Amino acid sequence: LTTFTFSGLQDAPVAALSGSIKLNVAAKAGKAEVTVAAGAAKAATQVSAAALRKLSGSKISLAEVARISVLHSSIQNYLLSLSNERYQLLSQWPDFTTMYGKDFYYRAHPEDLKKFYDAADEYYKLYETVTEFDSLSALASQVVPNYAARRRSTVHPAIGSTVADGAFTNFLLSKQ
Amino acid sequence: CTVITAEPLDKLERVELTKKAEKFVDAGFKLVMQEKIDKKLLGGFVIEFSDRRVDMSTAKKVEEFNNFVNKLVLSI
Amino acid sequence: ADAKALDELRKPKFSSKYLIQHVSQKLIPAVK
Amino acid sequence: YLAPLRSDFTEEITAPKVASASNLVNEWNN
Amino acid sequence: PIERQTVAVYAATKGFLDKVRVQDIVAAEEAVISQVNPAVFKILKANGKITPALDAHLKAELRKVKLPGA
Amino acid sequence: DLVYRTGQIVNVPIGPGTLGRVTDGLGQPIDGKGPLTNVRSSLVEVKAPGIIARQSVREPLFTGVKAVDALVPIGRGQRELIIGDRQTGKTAVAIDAIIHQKNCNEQVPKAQRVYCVYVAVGQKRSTVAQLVKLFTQTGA
Amino acid sequence: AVSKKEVLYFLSSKDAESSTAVKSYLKSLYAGAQVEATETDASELIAQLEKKYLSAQVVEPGVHNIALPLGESGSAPVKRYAAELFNLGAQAGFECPFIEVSKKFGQETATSETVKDVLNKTKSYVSADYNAALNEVLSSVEAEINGPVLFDGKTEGFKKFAAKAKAVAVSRGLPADTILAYCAGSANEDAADKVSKEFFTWFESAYTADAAAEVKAIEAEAASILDRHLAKPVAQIRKEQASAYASLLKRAETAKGAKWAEKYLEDVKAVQWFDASVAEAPASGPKVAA
Amino acid sequence: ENDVPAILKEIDSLVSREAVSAKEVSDAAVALTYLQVKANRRLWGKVLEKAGAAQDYDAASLTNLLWAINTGGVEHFKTVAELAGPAVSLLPSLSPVQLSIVVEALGGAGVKNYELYNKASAVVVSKIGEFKPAEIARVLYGVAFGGVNDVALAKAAGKVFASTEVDSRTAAQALYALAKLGRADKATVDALLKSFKKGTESASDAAAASFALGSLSFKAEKAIVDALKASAGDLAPAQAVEAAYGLALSGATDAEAFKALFGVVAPAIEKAPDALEVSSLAQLHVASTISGAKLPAAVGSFVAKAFGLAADAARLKRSSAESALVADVAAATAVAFGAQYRPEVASAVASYVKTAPDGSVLDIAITKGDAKVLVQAVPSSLLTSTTPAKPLGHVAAYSKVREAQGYAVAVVPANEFEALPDQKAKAQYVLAAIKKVAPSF
Numbered sequence A: 001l002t003t004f005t006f007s008g009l010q011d012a013p014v015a016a017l018s019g020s021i022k023l024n025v026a027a028k029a030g031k032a033e034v035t036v037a038a039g040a041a042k043a044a045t046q047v048s049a050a051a052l053r054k055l056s057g058s059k060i061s062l063a064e065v066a067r068i069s070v071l072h073s074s075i076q077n078y079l080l081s082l083s084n085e086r087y088q089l090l091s092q093w094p095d096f097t098t099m100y101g102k103d104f105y106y107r108a109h110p111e112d113l114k115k116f117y118d119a120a121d122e123y124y125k126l127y128e129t130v131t132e133f134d135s136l137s138a139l140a141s142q143v144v145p146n147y148a149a150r151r152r153s154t155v156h157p158a159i160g161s162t163v164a165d166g167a168f169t170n171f172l173l174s175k176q
Numbered sequence B: 001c002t003v004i005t006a007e008p009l010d011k012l013e014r015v016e017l018t019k020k021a022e023k024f025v026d027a028g029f030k031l032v033m034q035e036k037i038d039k040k041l042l043g044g045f046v047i048e049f050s051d052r053r054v055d056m057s058t059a060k061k062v063e064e065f066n067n068f069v070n071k072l073v074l075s076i
Numbered sequence C: 001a002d003a004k005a006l007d008e009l010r011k012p013k014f015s016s017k018y019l020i021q022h023v024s025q026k027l028i029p030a031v032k
Numbered sequence D: 001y002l003a004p005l006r007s008d009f010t011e012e013i014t015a016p017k018v019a020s021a022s023n024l025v026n027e028w029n030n
Numbered sequence E: 001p002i003e004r005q006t007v008a009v010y011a012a013t014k015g016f017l018d019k020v021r022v023q024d025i026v027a028a029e030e031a032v033i034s035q036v037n038p039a040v041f042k043i044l045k046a047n048g049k050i051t052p053a054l055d056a057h058l059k060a061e062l063r064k065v066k067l068p069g070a
Numbered sequence F: 001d002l003v004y005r006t007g008q009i010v011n012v013p014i015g016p017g018t019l020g021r022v023t024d025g026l027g028q029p030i031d032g033k034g035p036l037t038n039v040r041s042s043l044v045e046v047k048a049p050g051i052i053a054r055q056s057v058r059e060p061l062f063t064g065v066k067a068v069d070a071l072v073p074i075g076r077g078q079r080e081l082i083i084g085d086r087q088t089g090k091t092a093v094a095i096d097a098i099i100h101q102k103n104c105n106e107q108v109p110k111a112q113r114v115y116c117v118y119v120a121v122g123q124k125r126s127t128v129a130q131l132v133k134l135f136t137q138t139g140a
Numbered sequence G: 001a002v003s004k005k006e007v008l009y010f011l012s013s014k015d016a017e018s019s020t021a022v023k024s025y026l027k028s029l030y031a032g033a034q035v036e037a038t039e040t041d042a043s044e045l046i047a048q049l050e051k052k053y054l055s056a057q058v059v060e061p062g063v064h065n066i067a068l069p070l071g072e073s074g075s076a077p078v079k080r081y082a083a084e085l086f087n088l089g090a091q092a093g094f095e096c097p098f099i100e101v102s103k104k105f106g107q108e109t110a111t112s113e114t115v116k117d118v119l120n121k122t123k124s125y126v127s128a129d130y131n132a133a134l135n136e137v138l139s140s141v142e143a144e145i146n147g148p149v150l151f152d153g154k155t156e157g158f159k160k161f162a163a164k165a166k167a168v169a170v171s172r173g174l175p176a177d178t179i180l181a182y183c184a185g186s187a188n189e190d191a192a193d194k195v196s197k198e199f200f201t202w203f204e205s206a207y208t209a210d211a212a213a214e215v216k217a218i219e220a221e222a223a224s225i226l227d228r229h230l231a232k233p234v235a236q237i238r239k240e241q242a243s244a245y246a247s248l249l250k251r252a253e254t255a256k257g258a259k260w261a262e263k264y265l266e267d268v269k270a271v272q273w274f275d276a277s278v279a280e281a282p283a284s285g286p287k288v289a290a
Numbered sequence H: 001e002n003d004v005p006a007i008l009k010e011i012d013s014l015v016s017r018e019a020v021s022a023k024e025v026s027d028a029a030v031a032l033t034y035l036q037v038k039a040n041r042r043l044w045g046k047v048l049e050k051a052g053a054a055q056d057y058d059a060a061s062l063t064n065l066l067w068a069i070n071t072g073g074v075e076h077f078k079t080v081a082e083l084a085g086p087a088v089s090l091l092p093s094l095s096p097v098q099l100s101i102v103v104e105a106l107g108g109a110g111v112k113n114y115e116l117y118n119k120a121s122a123v124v125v126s127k128i129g130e131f132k133p134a135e136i137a138r139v140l141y142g143v144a145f146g147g148v149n150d151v152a153l154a155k156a157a158g159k160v161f162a163s164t165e166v167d168s169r170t171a172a173q174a175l176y177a178l179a180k181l182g183r184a185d186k187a188t189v190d191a192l193l194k195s196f197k198k199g200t201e202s203a204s205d206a207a208a209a210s211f212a213l214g215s216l217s218f219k220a221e222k223a224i225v226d227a228l229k230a231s232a233g234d235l236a237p238a239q240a241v242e243a244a245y246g247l248a249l250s251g252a253t254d255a256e257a258f259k260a261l262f263g264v265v266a267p268a269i270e271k272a273p274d275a276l277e278v279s280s281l282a283q284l285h286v287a288s289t290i291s292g293a294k295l296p297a298a299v300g301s302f303v304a305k306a307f308g309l310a311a312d313a314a315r316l317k318r319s320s321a322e323s324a325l326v327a328d329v330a331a332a333t334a335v336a337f338g339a340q341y342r343p344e345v346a347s348a349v350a351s352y353v354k355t356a357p358d359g360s361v362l363d364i365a366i367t368k369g370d371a372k373v374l375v376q377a378v379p380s381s382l383l384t385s386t387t388p389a390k391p392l393g394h395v396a397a398y399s400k401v402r403e404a405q406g407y408a409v410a411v412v413p414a415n416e417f418e419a420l421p422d423q424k425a426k427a428q429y430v431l432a433a434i435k436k437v438a439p440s441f
């Protein structure tokens, strides 16, 4: 945000848009009767037109408290988001334990039953590793250091090929 | 001699250069000179004596700087 | 031990910044 | 969770090497 | 390894591998390295010598072995 | 043509960064894995260590070849000739000494581990690529 | 403490640990300490070198504070990600990426008067897909006059090469007339206003496509790393990672007294605070000082 | 029954649930500004966390949210800059009174979105009569602070500010937008300057017109100055600095206006000296010098070092087309003072680089006994963006601080210096400019 801000009590929101919280402002020429109602609680104060202008004087400047970093947490959130797409297809696995009875054991070929008991031991291998979510935070550290070295470019952190080709067209198609 | 520079010299660029170059002849010798130009050099000069050369040009001082710091960051 | 700060909790942790500082403290005094 | 620290620069300006689609949605559907 | 070399040379120089066909001494010692105790190699590697507490203890453990033909 | 002197007697990069790499006759790597990191250039023609710098060859180098370690055993610091005609197994005695050191280096303390160097002079390049394939597969 | 050239580089920086080194320096300067006279020394090659290692101490914590927009839909997470790296360039002393890579061209080719050498030592900075599509036009125009095309501009042997390289620049998609008419300019401020609004329409579609190509490579790397990891049994995973975690601790523990190693193990202690502060109240999160 | 902290806990439980929509996160933000909740940062953090998560966004809830972010003074760049995705998709769906709040909030936060401001200025010039004068200033504040030097809008806004006279807060936003664009149009600044003796109600718009006049270097207003001297308790210490800096640069010397402004910033720096930016501590030392109104003994000595700090930091991070200009002007200063050969000019410009008294480094600092001159190159970033192209007010800021250090600053601007064809013409341009300031040389 800048140093001086020019908004407050002019072209303001007059009312809430939801029903979860009920806002009612009553603007006079000088001050305003706001009435807020959220849940069981209610509040109603008087906000001057020069009381909202002092609000943006000292800025809040929110910042994220991350376990490791904001970069790492965004890679780990993507690996958690990718593990969800693989967990959703282990959700659609047929219930093999409905065929564990001995009327399926003895009607079945002895080699097609050992394949069935191996395909059930395989699902527990796949499912116990897709729910190993404490391993996603160390897979995110295999993505970070190679990315962070591409950002330590000697040209610019935000440089890429399309810009650097577009600035070769300016460099080459001008005089020497 | 042969001195290769980047652009043609001043009359003071001539006089400061022999003071460099008669310290490359090891007795009471006199250098004549021969002046050539090369903008592949970025200033400085290359003195060529037909049996040795000395390159105090800054185009090689760049490369001798870069390979010193390309060797030293691999030693740390 | 609890409730550290905010400005101490905003630090990115395993950035380099101190390898970059280390190889700047043994290169610039070596190339000068 | 911790990474090897690296102190080196990228002198080229290249494309970022998109890796190939791993066969695991098509192996777990098999 | 050097401990399985000296055990196999012990089995040939202490007369434990005659009564064995000369064509399958190659296959006889493949039993001898594998059918004696895997703990008797560790003692010979740690000592470096075949001690008096081991040269009988191994040559009596080179009798509880099954050799081809025999 | 102009030939310039470099001022230096012939040298090669020595150090632990040469381990695992396939270099050429002057130490430049030919395995295609970049420059030799963590290495230092030393002269190739050094005066051999004299009488007062030696001690007696007392500890064994185990070849792993039992015709060798029983009959013609080799100490550490001893030059041993492998002489024979062509295709008699001279490399196989030498390769088995290198492969066995890998098996022994996983069991000994760090001080007594043997680091092999194989110099392949005048051989085929296919023969050398078969040896670094064997040494990668064995772990040597 | 900081060496007073770092703290001049951390004034416009906005990460945490650089600003707390600034704020404890400005608190020393409130208690009457003398601001040390900054050096009018360190000639051009040394000044370019320590600027490179001071910008990389503003860039390196700043890159770790920029969330990648992985798996997002739309252009505004990619335009946010690009704009955070623009501001990280400006905070670290870089100019615009157009002005930074063009300075890289004219510095690398200050010795060249032929085009085949210009297209050869600006090889690291342009696409090989674009370096080849200019070397095809160059070696046809040098097969037309049978003399090397000069980097002169007033030579007509360059003029019909530059008229064909302009046809290559549209064949990539680059508006070659728009880019040229921005970095040249115009006299009136109204006719140069309409060319800046269509350069910046190219430029924003240019740097979005470099950020979005960077995101699509991190997305493809992470999906490749995960699918290699989802094919492992769990006992392999936990000991592959505990081996990699413990090997990386002792690389920081055997490092005697280095500043990066104390900061490494101070951040392992700060991760374990984060895991412990969340265990005390998980619906709240970590405890901050308020 | 009037429960303000018990309604914060009822807002906290509205945004801490799982599927908060856009309207519930708009109105949670709107209710936190009307309640003035700067003290609770985590509750503002839970609202902007759900403001990025919220996917649907109609025209009314986006502008209620962006109003609340802007008015509340809460900044988080990642959240606000990704709200420019709803905005460029709702942009034909936006009211003209709503598009002014979007572009003011996204522009005032620094969102680098060229597709937004191109389409949002092309709308506001396609329907120029459809926008009231407060809305054309809000868009102008946004496109200026979003990094777009759109002078097509600054002309179309200038025709509106000439046809109708505007509110005081409307004008001071328009002055602040033209100050960052660096325009200094006499035709439109004076049309906005008459709005400031009808009575202004805020001190933030008296201080911002103060800053915008001094940055364009016009002059003080004598009712902006006298509104600022009464209501300098409404201003934050980073805002009173930019008022006093902008009054000093315009040439005001009303010392009672400066006692009011320095009565804010002095106990703030004494309470926490690291509270302000070092760019703002340097803007205090310019203001504590040109008007001459002094400061406390621990403050004015402390902001004197922070002019030395903030001047090297802009010299270390020099634009490299400014580094070309300084080494070009210093070479012409070698030829003007007598050096016809290249070993002379190479060893003269290494003698022009003396250190300033505050610890700084001056680039072309010539000393002849007692009289010292200083040559100042003013590239293009410190020029106005208009066709006369006089330098901005910040170069007279840097001049008067060095002039109070024993120098005689000769200004060499690159619009005049680089229209010259050779080095001899550029030598007598520098030699005339040095002798115009101290003719002892």
Ligand SMILES: Nc1ncnc2c1ncn2[C@@H]1O[C@H](COP(=O)(O)OP(=O)(O)OP(=O)(O)O)[C@@H](O)[C@H]1O
Pocket (backbone or CB within 6 Å): F084, F085, F086, F087, F088, F089, F090, F091, F092, F093
């Ligand atoms: N101990 C062994 N047992 C079985 N086969 C062996 C043995 N040693 C070598 N051979 C085989 O004999 C062949 C010759 O071996 P090797 O290549 O080691 O001989 P060499 O002395 O290196 O010959 P050259 O270098 O002249 O080609 C190889 O193909 C190898 O497979």
Ligand SMILES: [Mg+2]
Pocket (backbone or CB within 6 Å): F090, F091
């Ligand atoms: Mg052989």
